[PDB]
Scaffold this active site. Structure first.
Site, PDB file in Angstrom:
ATOM      1  N   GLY A 161       0.851  -1.174   0.000  1.00 16.27           N
ATOM      2  CA  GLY A 161       0.000   0.000   0.000  1.00 16.27           C
ATOM      3  C   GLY A 161       0.888   1.226   0.000  1.00 16.27           C
ATOM      4  O   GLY A 161       2.068   1.130   0.316  1.00 16.27           O
ATOM      5  N   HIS A 169      -2.003   7.164   7.411  1.00  9.37           N
ATOM      6  CA  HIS A 169      -1.120   8.096   6.724  1.00  9.37           C
ATOM      7  C   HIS A 169      -1.823   9.399   6.354  1.00  9.37           C
ATOM      8  O   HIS A 169      -1.211  10.473   6.375  1.00  9.37           O
ATOM      9  CB  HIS A 169      -0.573   7.470   5.451  1.00  9.37           C
ATOM     10  CG  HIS A 169       0.618   6.598   5.667  1.00  9.37           C
ATOM     11  ND1 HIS A 169       1.804   7.036   6.222  1.00  9.37           N
ATOM     12  CD2 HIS A 169       0.816   5.294   5.349  1.00  9.37           C
ATOM     13  CE1 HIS A 169       2.663   6.014   6.215  1.00  9.37           C
ATOM     14  NE2 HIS A 169       2.109   4.938   5.698  1.00  9.37           N
ATOM     15  N   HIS A 216      -3.767   1.007   8.138  1.00  9.74           N
ATOM     16  CA  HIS A 216      -2.411   1.516   8.054  1.00  9.74           C
ATOM     17  C   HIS A 216      -2.339   2.659   7.044  1.00  9.74           C
ATOM     18  O   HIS A 216      -1.836   3.742   7.355  1.00  9.74           O
ATOM     19  CB  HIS A 216      -1.456   0.398   7.633  1.00  9.74           C
ATOM     20  CG  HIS A 216      -0.033   0.837   7.491  1.00  9.74           C
ATOM     21  ND1 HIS A 216       0.981   0.459   8.344  1.00  9.74           N
ATOM     22  CD2 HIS A 216       0.541   1.665   6.582  1.00  9.74           C
ATOM     23  CE1 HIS A 216       2.111   1.061   7.936  1.00  9.74           C
ATOM     24  NE2 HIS A 216       1.893   1.805   6.868  1.00  9.74           N
ATOM     25  N   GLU A 217      -2.840   2.414   5.833  1.00  7.64           N
ATOM     26  CA  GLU A 217      -2.814   3.424   4.778  1.00  7.64           C
ATOM     27  C   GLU A 217      -3.626   4.660   5.115  1.00  7.64           C
ATOM     28  O   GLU A 217      -3.201   5.779   4.836  1.00  7.64           O
ATOM     29  CB  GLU A 217      -3.312   2.842   3.450  1.00  7.64           C
ATOM     30  CG  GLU A 217      -2.497   1.668   2.940  1.00  7.64           C
ATOM     31  CD  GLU A 217      -1.003   1.882   3.106  1.00  7.64           C
ATOM     32  OE1 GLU A 217      -0.530   3.014   2.860  1.00  7.64           O
ATOM     33  OE2 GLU A 217      -0.302   0.917   3.481  1.00  7.64           O
ATOM     34  N   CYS A 223       6.581  -0.175   7.119  1.00  7.27           N
ATOM     35  CA  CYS A 223       6.071   0.986   6.413  1.00  7.27           C
ATOM     36  C   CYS A 223       7.167   1.495   5.507  1.00  7.27           C
ATOM     37  O   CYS A 223       8.318   1.598   5.921  1.00  7.27           O
ATOM     38  CB  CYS A 223       5.664   2.075   7.406  1.00  7.27           C
ATOM     39  SG  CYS A 223       5.203   3.648   6.630  1.00  7.27           S
ATOM     40  N   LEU A 224       6.818   1.812   4.267  1.00  8.35           N
ATOM     41  CA  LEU A 224       7.811   2.298   3.325  1.00  8.35           C
ATOM     42  C   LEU A 224       8.469   3.577   3.826  1.00  8.35           C
ATOM     43  O   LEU A 224       9.574   3.914   3.404  1.00  8.35           O
ATOM     44  CB  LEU A 224       7.168   2.514   1.955  1.00  8.35           C
ATOM     45  CG  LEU A 224       6.545   1.223   1.410  1.00  8.35           C
ATOM     46  CD1 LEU A 224       5.899   1.487   0.061  1.00  8.35           C
ATOM     47  CD2 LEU A 224       7.616   0.149   1.303  1.00  8.35           C
ATOM     48  N   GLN A 250       3.045   9.968   1.625  1.00 15.62           N
ATOM     49  CA  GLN A 250       4.337   9.309   1.579  1.00 15.62           C
ATOM     50  C   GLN A 250       5.186   9.783   0.423  1.00 15.62           C
ATOM     51  O   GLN A 250       6.406   9.623   0.443  1.00 15.62           O
ATOM     52  CB  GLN A 250       4.169   7.797   1.508  1.00 15.62           C
ATOM     53  CG  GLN A 250       3.350   7.223   2.646  1.00 15.62           C
ATOM     54  CD  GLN A 250       3.429   5.713   2.706  1.00 15.62           C
ATOM     55  OE1 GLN A 250       4.440   5.146   3.149  1.00 15.62           O
ATOM     56  NE2 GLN A 250       2.375   5.047   2.248  1.00 15.62           N
TER      57      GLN A 250
HETATM   58 ZN   LIG Z   1       3.058   3.080   5.645  1.00 13.45          ZN
END
Ligand SMILES: [Zn+2]
Ligand SMILES: [Zn+2]
Lengths: 172, 172
Positions: free
Chosen positions: A48, A147, A143-144, A101-102, A53
């Site tokens: 995701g 953000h 999670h997404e 998480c990226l 981000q």
């Molecule tokens: Zn993330």
């Protein structure tokens, strides 16, 4: 095209995202963004990715799996475009998971989120959805969406002791 | 010799360290450890290092600065060997600081610790001390002693929002 992913520490990741308009989703810029987000997410082996981000404070999220190597035993997540999402937990039950998480590269932290939620959202075509979601997908969406509220999974760690670097956690 | 520094995630860093005995500090093994810890700390540009960080669950700590490049505007810390330390805060006043840790590479987190403490300890010669410590040194000692209690600075973050990767925090 692949865009640079912002790391925890960048204040953008803690700001709140603006909702996207119906007119907006028809522009080429929006289409180009979605394309880049998918490229970016895929290249980073993500499941995701939220607009914040990559520096855009808009309630835009993309998901999509297929034999994800960063999260070994998880079910694939069909590709979707989630806009202006709104999640409401439907249960107090949680299914702990070691999230990554990226924007927090090289780490994993144990997080317990409701395993059954209601999500209202709009897709790239302006269609409105209001569904019950559970399992892994429910974790990914919460999670997404976090953000979009300037929230990172480190803010929801069950215990700072259950947090660490990948290679170390893997060897332990 | 330089020893490998354990990263957050390794359960050793969360275990409690055993105190060192007077007989112990006279052994060659102990002397070799202290030497390695200093080598390890210096090579990593650290200002302090606890035995647990290199895999030894003993209440052994080494400190020492001199133009530290990891913590830019801080006063030098004279080299010392701190054994079986016991800290007691003498104040509720705190001096916030963006802490780092050799066991949590690439990150910094804002931590507020008492700025005046009492520390009881023993040095490499078996001498006992009981002094009031403040300033930067007080932060370093509390940080290092936390390691002996299986505590990392991430467990004392004032706010998970004030936490991130170096290069990003520096650019923001
Ligand atoms: Zn993330
Ligand atoms: Zn440390």
């Amino acid at each position: 095209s692949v865009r640079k992913i912002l790391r925890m520490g960048d204040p953008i990741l803690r700001k709140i995202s603006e909702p996207v308009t119906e007119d907006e989703i028809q522009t080429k810029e929006f289409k180009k963004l979605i394309r880049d987000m998918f490229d970016t997410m895929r290249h980073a082996e993500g499941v995701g990715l939220a607009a914040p981000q990559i520096g855009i404070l808009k309630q835009i999220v993309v998901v999509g799996s297929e034999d994800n190597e960063r999260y070994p035993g998880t079910p694939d997540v069909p590709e979707r475009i989630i806009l202006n999402p709104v999640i409401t937990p439907l249960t107090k039950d949680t299914s702990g998971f070691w999230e990554g998480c990226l924007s927090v590269p090289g780490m994993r932290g144990y997080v317990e989120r409701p395993n059954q939620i209601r999500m209202q959202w709009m897709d790239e075509k302006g269609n409105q959805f209001d569904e019950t979601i559970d399992g892994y997908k429910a974790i990914v969406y919460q999670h997404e969406c976090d953000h979009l509220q300037g929230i990172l999974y480190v803010d929801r760690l069950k215990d700072t002791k259950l947090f660490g670097f990948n290679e170390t956690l893997d060897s332990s």
